[PDB]
Design an enzyme around this catalytic site. Structure first.
Site, PDB file in Angstrom:
ATOM      1  N   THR A  75      39.284  20.073  50.395  1.00  0.00           N
ATOM      2  CA  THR A  75      40.749  20.072  50.448  1.00  0.00           C
ATOM      3  C   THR A  75      41.397  21.446  50.311  1.00  0.00           C
ATOM      4  OG1 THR A  75      40.930  17.749  49.770  1.00  0.00           O
ATOM      5  CG2 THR A  75      42.829  19.148  49.335  1.00  0.00           C
ATOM      6  N   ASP A 135      43.003  10.350  52.647  1.00  0.00           N
ATOM      7  CA  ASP A 135      41.853  10.818  51.903  1.00  0.00           C
ATOM      8  C   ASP A 135      41.552   9.937  50.671  1.00  0.00           C
ATOM      9  OD1 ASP A 135      41.114  12.669  49.368  1.00  0.00           O
ATOM     10  OD2 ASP A 135      39.928  13.335  51.047  1.00  0.00           O
ATOM     11  N   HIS A 171      37.892   7.907  50.178  1.00  0.00           N
ATOM     12  CA  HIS A 171      36.891   8.108  49.143  1.00  0.00           C
ATOM     13  C   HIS A 171      36.419   6.766  48.588  1.00  0.00           C
ATOM     14  CE1 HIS A 171      36.345  12.393  48.651  1.00  0.00           C
ATOM     15  NE2 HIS A 171      37.647  12.568  48.789  1.00  0.00           N
ATOM     16  N   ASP A 225      43.485  18.228  57.057  1.00  0.00           N
ATOM     17  CA  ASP A 225      42.651  19.298  56.493  1.00  0.00           C
ATOM     18  C   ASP A 225      41.135  19.138  56.781  1.00  0.00           C
ATOM     19  OD1 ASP A 225      42.443  17.175  54.666  1.00  0.00           O
ATOM     20  OD2 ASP A 225      42.793  18.421  52.915  1.00  0.00           O
ATOM     21  N   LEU A 271      30.756  41.650  59.728  1.00  0.00           N
ATOM     22  CA  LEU A 271      31.205  42.807  60.486  1.00  0.00           C
ATOM     23  C   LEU A 271      30.078  43.794  60.753  1.00  0.00           C
ATOM     24  CD1 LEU A 271      34.313  43.559  58.262  1.00  0.00           C
ATOM     25  CD2 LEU A 271      34.339  42.247  60.423  1.00  0.00           C
ATOM     26  N   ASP A 322      27.570  46.614  60.797  1.00  0.00           N
ATOM     27  CA  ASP A 322      27.226  47.668  59.826  1.00  0.00           C
ATOM     28  C   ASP A 322      27.294  49.067  60.439  1.00  0.00           C
ATOM     29  OD1 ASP A 322      26.588  45.588  58.103  1.00  0.00           O
ATOM     30  OD2 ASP A 322      24.426  45.938  58.234  1.00  0.00           O
TER      31      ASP A 322
HETATM   32  C1  LIG Z   1      38.924  38.001  58.210  1.00  0.00           C
HETATM   33  O1  LIG Z   1      40.170  38.687  58.083  1.00  0.00           O
HETATM   34  C2  LIG Z   1      40.322  39.499  56.945  1.00  0.00           C
HETATM   35  C3  LIG Z   1      41.747  40.068  56.869  1.00  0.00           C
HETATM   36  O2  LIG Z   1      42.010  40.858  58.008  1.00  0.00           O
HETATM   37  C4  LIG Z   1      39.239  40.585  56.931  1.00  0.00           C
HETATM   38  O3  LIG Z   1      39.152  41.059  55.611  1.00  0.00           O
HETATM   39  C5  LIG Z   1      39.640  42.392  55.459  1.00  0.00           C
HETATM   40  O4  LIG Z   1      38.623  43.310  55.818  1.00  0.00           O
HETATM   41  C6  LIG Z   1      38.932  44.682  55.614  1.00  0.00           C
HETATM   42  C7  LIG Z   1      37.717  45.523  56.007  1.00  0.00           C
HETATM   43  O5  LIG Z   1      36.583  45.117  55.253  1.00  0.00           O
HETATM   44  C8  LIG Z   1      39.352  44.970  54.159  1.00  0.00           C
HETATM   45  O6  LIG Z   1      39.783  46.323  54.063  1.00  0.00           O
HETATM   46  C9  LIG Z   1      39.422  46.925  52.791  1.00  0.00           C
HETATM   47  O7  LIG Z   1      40.495  46.801  51.867  1.00  0.00           O
HETATM   48  C10 LIG Z   1      40.309  47.351  50.572  1.00  0.00           C
HETATM   49  C11 LIG Z   1      41.585  47.081  49.774  1.00  0.00           C
HETATM   50  O8  LIG Z   1      41.952  45.734  49.987  1.00  0.00           O
HETATM   51  C12 LIG Z   1      42.887  45.237  49.001  1.00  0.00           C
HETATM   52  O9  LIG Z   1      44.209  45.116  49.514  1.00  0.00           O
HETATM   53  C13 LIG Z   1      44.364  44.158  50.556  1.00  0.00           C
HETATM   54  C14 LIG Z   1      45.774  44.237  51.145  1.00  0.00           C
HETATM   55  O10 LIG Z   1      46.729  43.661  50.277  1.00  0.00           O
HETATM   56  C15 LIG Z   1      44.004  42.756  50.038  1.00  0.00           C
HETATM   57  O11 LIG Z   1      44.106  41.803  51.074  1.00  0.00           O
HETATM   58  C16 LIG Z   1      42.588  42.740  49.449  1.00  0.00           C
HETATM   59  O12 LIG Z   1      42.336  41.442  48.924  1.00  0.00           O
HETATM   60  C17 LIG Z   1      40.933  41.192  48.641  1.00  0.00           C
HETATM   61  O13 LIG Z   1      40.629  41.413  47.272  1.00  0.00           O
HETATM   62  C18 LIG Z   1      41.452  40.627  46.416  1.00  0.00           C
HETATM   63  C19 LIG Z   1      41.319  41.093  44.974  1.00  0.00           C
HETATM   64  O14 LIG Z   1      39.961  41.348  44.702  1.00  0.00           O
HETATM   65  C20 LIG Z   1      41.158  39.130  46.622  1.00  0.00           C
HETATM   66  O15 LIG Z   1      42.047  38.321  45.883  1.00  0.00           O
HETATM   67  C21 LIG Z   1      41.284  38.755  48.106  1.00  0.00           C
HETATM   68  O16 LIG Z   1      40.829  37.425  48.298  1.00  0.00           O
HETATM   69  C22 LIG Z   1      40.531  39.748  49.010  1.00  0.00           C
HETATM   70  O17 LIG Z   1      39.139  39.545  48.798  1.00  0.00           O
HETATM   71  C23 LIG Z   1      38.291  39.573  49.971  1.00  0.00           C
HETATM   72  O18 LIG Z   1      38.111  40.882  50.517  1.00  0.00           O
HETATM   73  C24 LIG Z   1      37.389  41.807  49.696  1.00  0.00           C
HETATM   74  C25 LIG Z   1      37.427  43.209  50.308  1.00  0.00           C
HETATM   75  O19 LIG Z   1      38.728  43.738  50.148  1.00  0.00           O
HETATM   76  C26 LIG Z   1      35.965  41.290  49.425  1.00  0.00           C
HETATM   77  O20 LIG Z   1      35.255  42.154  48.561  1.00  0.00           O
HETATM   78  C27 LIG Z   1      36.030  39.882  48.817  1.00  0.00           C
HETATM   79  O21 LIG Z   1      34.731  39.343  48.739  1.00  0.00           O
HETATM   80  C28 LIG Z   1      36.928  38.937  49.629  1.00  0.00           C
HETATM   81  O22 LIG Z   1      36.235  38.572  50.805  1.00  0.00           O
HETATM   82  C29 LIG Z   1      42.422  43.885  48.429  1.00  0.00           C
HETATM   83  O23 LIG Z   1      43.157  43.586  47.263  1.00  0.00           O
HETATM   84  C30 LIG Z   1      39.986  48.849  50.664  1.00  0.00           C
HETATM   85  O24 LIG Z   1      39.679  49.319  49.370  1.00  0.00           O
HETATM   86  C31 LIG Z   1      38.830  49.149  51.638  1.00  0.00           C
HETATM   87  O25 LIG Z   1      38.720  50.558  51.849  1.00  0.00           O
HETATM   88  C32 LIG Z   1      37.378  51.114  51.681  1.00  0.00           C
HETATM   89  O26 LIG Z   1      36.680  51.318  52.906  1.00  0.00           O
HETATM   90  C33 LIG Z   1      37.429  52.137  53.802  1.00  0.00           C
HETATM   91  C34 LIG Z   1      36.859  52.097  55.220  1.00  0.00           C
HETATM   92  O27 LIG Z   1      37.943  52.099  56.125  1.00  0.00           O
HETATM   93  C35 LIG Z   1      37.563  53.576  53.283  1.00  0.00           C
HETATM   94  O28 LIG Z   1      38.620  54.235  53.961  1.00  0.00           O
HETATM   95  C36 LIG Z   1      37.845  53.671  51.779  1.00  0.00           C
HETATM   96  O29 LIG Z   1      37.205  54.847  51.329  1.00  0.00           O
HETATM   97  C37 LIG Z   1      37.407  52.461  50.921  1.00  0.00           C
HETATM   98  O30 LIG Z   1      36.136  52.738  50.361  1.00  0.00           O
HETATM   99  C38 LIG Z   1      36.223  52.829  48.921  1.00  0.00           C
HETATM  100  O31 LIG Z   1      35.902  51.604  48.281  1.00  0.00           O
HETATM  101  C39 LIG Z   1      34.581  51.149  48.556  1.00  0.00           C
HETATM  102  C40 LIG Z   1      34.398  49.729  48.027  1.00  0.00           C
HETATM  103  O32 LIG Z   1      34.983  49.626  46.748  1.00  0.00           O
HETATM  104  C41 LIG Z   1      33.567  52.139  47.972  1.00  0.00           C
HETATM  105  O33 LIG Z   1      32.256  51.772  48.334  1.00  0.00           O
HETATM  106  C42 LIG Z   1      33.831  53.561  48.483  1.00  0.00           C
HETATM  107  O34 LIG Z   1      32.981  54.459  47.797  1.00  0.00           O
HETATM  108  C43 LIG Z   1      35.320  53.950  48.381  1.00  0.00           C
HETATM  109  O35 LIG Z   1      35.695  54.241  47.046  1.00  0.00           O
HETATM  110  C44 LIG Z   1      39.003  48.393  52.976  1.00  0.00           C
HETATM  111  O36 LIG Z   1      39.943  49.033  53.812  1.00  0.00           O
HETATM  112  C45 LIG Z   1      40.431  43.983  53.677  1.00  0.00           C
HETATM  113  O37 LIG Z   1      40.714  44.109  52.287  1.00  0.00           O
HETATM  114  C46 LIG Z   1      40.059  42.528  53.990  1.00  0.00           C
HETATM  115  N1  LIG Z   1      41.199  41.667  53.672  1.00  0.00           N
HETATM  116  C47 LIG Z   1      41.122  40.426  53.153  1.00  0.00           C
HETATM  117  C48 LIG Z   1      42.410  39.682  52.882  1.00  0.00           C
HETATM  118  O38 LIG Z   1      40.063  39.857  52.890  1.00  0.00           O
HETATM  119  C49 LIG Z   1      37.855  40.022  57.283  1.00  0.00           C
HETATM  120  O39 LIG Z   1      36.990  41.096  57.558  1.00  0.00           O
HETATM  121  C50 LIG Z   1      37.874  39.063  58.469  1.00  0.00           C
HETATM  122  N2  LIG Z   1      36.568  38.466  58.635  1.00  0.00           N
HETATM  123  C51 LIG Z   1      35.871  38.541  59.779  1.00  0.00           C
HETATM  124  C52 LIG Z   1      34.520  37.884  59.799  1.00  0.00           C
HETATM  125  O40 LIG Z   1      36.296  39.079  60.798  1.00  0.00           O
HETATM  126 CA   LIG Z   2      41.450  17.077  51.479  1.00  0.00          CA
HETATM  127 CA   LIG Z   3      28.348  44.287  57.763  1.00  0.00          CA
HETATM  128 ZN   LIG Z   4      38.961  14.085  49.446  1.00  0.00          ZN
END
Ligand SMILES: *[C@@H]1O[C@H](CO)[C@@H](O[C@@H]2O[C@H](CO)[C@@H](O[C@@H]3O[C@H](CO[C@H]4O[C@H](CO)[C@@H](O)[C@H](O[C@H]5O[C@H](CO)[C@@H](O)[C@H](O)[C@@H]5O[C@H]5O[C@H](CO)[C@@H](O)[C@H](O)[C@@H]5O)[C@@H]4O)[C@@H](O)[C@H](O[C@H]4O[C@H](CO)[C@@H](O)[C@H](O)[C@@H]4O[C@H]4O[C@H](CO)[C@@H](O)[C@H](O)[C@@H]4O)[C@@H]3O)[C@H](O)[C@H]2NC(C)=O)[C@H](O)[C@H]1NC(C)=O
Ligand SMILES: [Ca+2]
Ligand SMILES: [Ca+2]
Ligand SMILES: [Zn+2]
Ligand SMILES: O=C(c1ccc2[nH]nnc2c1)N1C[C@H]2CN(C(=O)c3cc(OCC(F)(F)F)c4ccccc4n3)C[C@@H]2C1
Ligand SMILES: [Cl-]
Ligand SMILES: [K+]
Ligand code: NA
Length: 806
Positions: free
Chosen positions: A159, A261, A265, A308, A689, A691
């Site tokens: 859900t 739903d 169930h 959903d 994504l 590598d």
């Molecule tokens: C599906 O779509 C989504 C959305 O478009 C795609 O996900 C995006 O992918 C981007 C690329 O990976 C990623 O960009 C990174 O953002 C980092 C900051 O992000 C914060 O701010 C945003 C904007 O508000 C916010 O959305 C983020 O929210 C995440 O984290 C919060 C709090 O923890 C969670 O509540 C939330 O659910 C979300 O979590 C998810 O994403 C994170 C990654 O952010 C995962 O770890 C989780 O598991 C979860 O899936 C954040 O609050 C930013 O820091 C990154 O920048 C690094 O890399 C760049 C390269 O360009 C570089 O310039 C910088 O140096 C930096 O590196 C530094 O940090 C590294 C790691 O700590 C370290 O190793 C280095 O040494 C450096 O210090 C990066 O730009 C973006 O955040 C997410 N967005 C979301 C919403 O998930 C997704 O890819 C798509 N999927 C597919 C399959 O296509």
């Molecule tokens: Ca449901």
């Molecule tokens: Ca990868």
């Molecule tokens: Zn249910």
């Protein structure tokens, strides 16, 4: 604590929530136990019921009534929904013929057509056909609007992951709601269905539609409804909000129903008790549409009817117990049910070994109804790995089954007859989509699509710019009459090199050998032409893929295939070739079994070498264009070029060889020719994504040859299969896969048998969208076709599921 001694007078269902300890009057106050003392009396009036009756017509307003039949009710915006039918001789919306809505027909002051999302929990896709007799309102929406046969939910088909995917366009792994139940080890905190922790905003990632709207100056009704607010009251409230002044009236609204739903169930998807809940939902739809007609909004509002997930037959006797496999059952924590997630009970236990847990769960019983995985080995289409809340160990449970830890967990928690949560390709998990309104098309069926796509479209419907999300914006343009989003192709970042013959055989010291020294003017002009790309129009049907990142690579032409060869990864990023229905399979001639040949267009320094494969006892090799499909004995030499070589575990070679030797020919026969693009995928951090080179965790021993985690193929032909793949005048048809590159075949319990018994089944399991492969490779396919781009985007989001008919 809440100072609940204020009042809801004038504030019933207030759109802006008030700050504690001032008591609340919004549709969520019940859930926080923070409603004002008079909330029930003032806001949840029930007196006289929900329908006007003949005698109530033109009555004197009595504010105690749940709804009104007085003369002033229309302008007050609080008539019962049937008021005009009973008192003004109007007809019910369902009884009116439907009429195309070419333009929004709205009251003055409406700046955009409102959007109303009508969400129904557990509404299985086949209810539309199987329940049609008892759902006349829903059936009119469906046949008069735009509908899909079904909509694909996200995994897990629970859900909260799905409602929040609807709201955000994100995969659960990205939005963070990875289950109805979760543990976050960074917070050290738990999320459950029952309880308060789920209200903490830190669980909920991304940007849901109500926030997207707010930030862009579009007012939103609140999306959530507490259980105790009856459906009829939810409808009247939305209708009342629609009577607000222009400056106060929201543009987007949500209704939610816990049915079907809840019943499903208890009674199973098709239990006889299910007819009633379906009738009742229809009646609610009827009240909305009548209420909208009354307000002259029935040809102004866009309405989305959306589920959903579906519902499957699941009973207690169909439970697998981890106590029948693990002797160490008390040292694990299991998230149970229609999926399994396992972690250690105590992190202070250094004797906990995921590897031996997995092995103890692998193929241990003849008809085992679940399969263990490390999360990075799950089918890539599930996009279920890149979150710290998703446990390393996962069980994919067969449809109709449950997994539990101990038998005591089941009889001391048969109650239920239905459940959901299974793999999102499963027919019984499929759900519904209908769009009805000025912005949607008239009487149009569209193909099945994924619920991750809807956020974009709801943004389009509201004139909003969507936050970054996992939808593919434009892939649903064919649902819309207008408001379309016209995307452009991404710009190529790296242009290829086109190398000629630049190296002599003796410059290569790769430890490779080939019995190819068995050597005309007519046929050397010809073979030179092939190397300059003379046959390229045949094997590269949709243009070359574009490279969307910065890298160094070469285009290599051959008689039977073209490749984009990475000097960085030492192998092709893609290999493209067309196999006509007429094509003949041949074998690798005895003398050429171990033949690998240097490519005189590509330096030793940017080449693989045979010695590393000899030294690496684990790693063997295969080829991306298959020798078996060479067009002639002389063309076959091309297939043994070191530049067509990729590293493969022997276990995976069994899979790959069967695909190339048997399956490509078969698909060519069945589809009247196929174009194939195959290549490697590196996703060591399982983020879905591509590598970068500094992310690669494994190389062929003693070399810089990186090992792929996956191999993909994209198999294209003509939708009209009376036309050959290489001469198709219209729409295309595609199936693709992303096979995991694994050193064993443990995933397939039948793998000791012949490849004809298990390989194709493994491939089907790892079916993929072209779009999944784009994310994983940084490539952009179908650059050059005669099709509209929006059609190509639809094609790229297509997933071949291999399920039977709905
Ligand atoms: C599906 O779509 C989504 C959305 O478009 C795609 O996900 C995006 O992918 C981007 C690329 O990976 C990623 O960009 C990174 O953002 C980092 C900051 O992000 C914060 O701010 C945003 C904007 O508000 C916010 O959305 C983020 O929210 C995440 O984290 C919060 C709090 O923890 C969670 O509540 C939330 O659910 C979300 O979590 C998810 O994403 C994170 C990654 O952010 C995962 O770890 C989780 O598991 C979860 O899936 C954040 O609050 C930013 O820091 C990154 O920048 C690094 O890399 C760049 C390269 O360009 C570089 O310039 C910088 O140096 C930096 O590196 C530094 O940090 C590294 C790691 O700590 C370290 O190793 C280095 O040494 C450096 O210090 C990066 O730009 C973006 O955040 C997410 N967005 C979301 C919403 O998930 C997704 O890819 C798509 N999927 C597919 C399959 O296509
Ligand atoms: Ca449901
Ligand atoms: Ca990868
Ligand atoms: Zn249910
Ligand atoms: O009792 C259950 C339940 C139901 C089915 C189950 N099967 N198995 N166990 C179950 C437990 N509940 C309480 C319901 C109230 N609710 C919302 O009000 C809601 C609406 C949204 O949207 C409705 C909309 F789609 F129309 F917008 C959201 C959207 C995003 C996130 C959360 C949302 N929550 C969802 C909750 C699930
Ligand atoms: Cl869950
Ligand atoms: K080897
Ligand atoms: Na096996």
């Amino acid at each position: 604590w809440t100072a609940t001694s204020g009042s809801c007078k004038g504030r019933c269902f207030e759109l802006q929530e008030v700050g504690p300890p001032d008591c609340r009057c919004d549709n969520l106050c019940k859930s926080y136990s923070s409603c004002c003392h008079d909330f029930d009396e003032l806001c949840l009036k029930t007196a006289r019921g929900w329908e006007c009756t003949k005698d109530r017509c033109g009555e004197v307003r009595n504010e105690e009534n749940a709804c009104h039949c007085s003369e002033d009710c229309l302008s007050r915006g609080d008539c019962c929904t049937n008021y005009q039918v009973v008192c003004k001789g109007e007809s019910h919306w369902v009884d009116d013929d439907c009429e195309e809505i070419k333009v929004p027909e709205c009251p003055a002051g409406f700046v955009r057509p409102p959007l109303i999302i009508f969400s129904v929990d557990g509404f299985r896709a086949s209810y539309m056909k199987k329940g049609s007799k008892v759902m006349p309102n829903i059936e009119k929406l469906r046949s008069c609007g735009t509908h899909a046969p079904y909509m694909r939910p996200v995994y897990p088909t629970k859900t909260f992951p799905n409602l929040y995917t609807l709201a955000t366009g994100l995969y659960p792994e990205s939005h963070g709601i990875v289950g109805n139940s979760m543990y976050d080890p960074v917070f050290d905190a738990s999320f459950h269905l029952r309880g308060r922790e789920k209200f903490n905003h830190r669980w909920w990632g991304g940007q849901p539609l109500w926030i997207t709207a707010t930030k862009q100056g579009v007012r939103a009704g609140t999306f959530f409804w507490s259980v105790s607010i009856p459906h009829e009251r939810r409808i009247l409230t939305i209708l009342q909000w629609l009577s607000l002044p222009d400056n106060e009236r929201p543009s987007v609204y949500a209704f939610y129903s816990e049915q079907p739903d809840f019943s499903g169930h208890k009674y199973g998807p098709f239990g006889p008790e299910m007819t009633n809940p379906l009738r009742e939902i229809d009646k609610t739809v009827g009240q909305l549409m009548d209420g909208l007609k009354q307000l002259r909004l029935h040809r102004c509002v866009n309405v989305i009817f959306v589920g959903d997930h579906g519902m499957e037959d699941v009973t207690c006797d169909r439970t697998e117990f981890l106590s029948n496999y693990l002797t160490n059952v008390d040292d694990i924590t299991l998230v149970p049910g229609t999926l399994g997630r396992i972690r250690a009970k105590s992190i202070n236990n250094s004797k906990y070994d995921p590897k031996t847990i997995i092995a103890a769960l692998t193929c241990k019983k003849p008809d085992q109804h679940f399969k263990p995985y490390m999360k990075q080995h799950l089918p890539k289409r599930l996009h279920y790995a890149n979150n710290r809340r998703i446990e390393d160990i996962h069980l994919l449970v067969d449809r109709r089954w449950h997994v539990a830890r101990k038998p005591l967990d089941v009889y001391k928690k048969c109650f239920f007859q239905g459940d959901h949560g299974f793999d999102n390709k499963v027919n019984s998990m499929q759900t519904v989509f209908v769009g009805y309104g000025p912005t949607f098309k008239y009487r149009t069926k569209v193909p099945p699509f994924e619920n991750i796509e809807l956020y974009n479209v709801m943004c389009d419907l509201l004139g909003l710019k969507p936050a970054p999300n996992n939808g593919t914006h434009g892939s649903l343009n064919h649902l819309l009459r207008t408001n379309t989003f016209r995307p452009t192709m991404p710009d190529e970042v790296s242009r290829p090199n086109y190398p000629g013959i630049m190296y002599l055989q003796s410059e290569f010291d790769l430890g490779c050998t080939c019995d190819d020294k068995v050597e005309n003017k007519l046929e050397e002009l010809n073979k030179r032409l092939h190397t300059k790309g003379s046959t390229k129009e045949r094997h590269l049907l949709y243009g070359r893929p574009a490279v969307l990142y910065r890298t160094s690579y070469d285009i290599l032409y051959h008689t039977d295939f073209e490749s984009g060869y990475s000097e960085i990864f030492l192998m092709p990023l893609w290999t493209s070739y067309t196999i006509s229905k007429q094509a003949e399979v041949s074998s690798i001639p005895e003398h050429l079994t171990n033949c690998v040949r240097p490519d005189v267009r590509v330096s030793p320094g940017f080449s693989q070498n045979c010695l590393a494969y000899k030294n690496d006892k684990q790693m063997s090799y295969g080829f991306l264009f298959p020798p078996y499909l060479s067009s002639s004995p002389e063309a076959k030499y091309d297939a043994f070029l070191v530049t067509n070589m990729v590293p493969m575990y022997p276990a995976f070679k069994r899979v790959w060889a069967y695909f190339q030797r048997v399956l490509v020919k078969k698909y060519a026969s069945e589809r009247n020719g196929v174009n194939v693009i195959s290549g490697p995928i590196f996703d060591y951090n399982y983020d879905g994504l591509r590598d970068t080179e500094d992310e690669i965790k494994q190389y062929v021993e003693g070399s810089s040859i990186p090992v792929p985690t996956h191999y993909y193929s994209i198999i294209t032909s003509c939708l009209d299969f009376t036309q050959p793949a290489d001469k198709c005048d219209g729409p295309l048809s595609v199936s693709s896969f992303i096979l995991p590159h694994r050193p064993d075949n443990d995933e397939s319990c039948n793998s000791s048998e012949d490849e004809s018994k298990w390989v194709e089944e493994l491939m089907k399991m790892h079916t993929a969208r072209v779009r999944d492969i784009e994310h994983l490779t940084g490539l952009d396919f179908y650059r050059k076709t005669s099709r509209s781009y929006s059609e190509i985007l639809t094609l790229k989001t297509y997933l071949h599921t291999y399920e039977s008919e709905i």
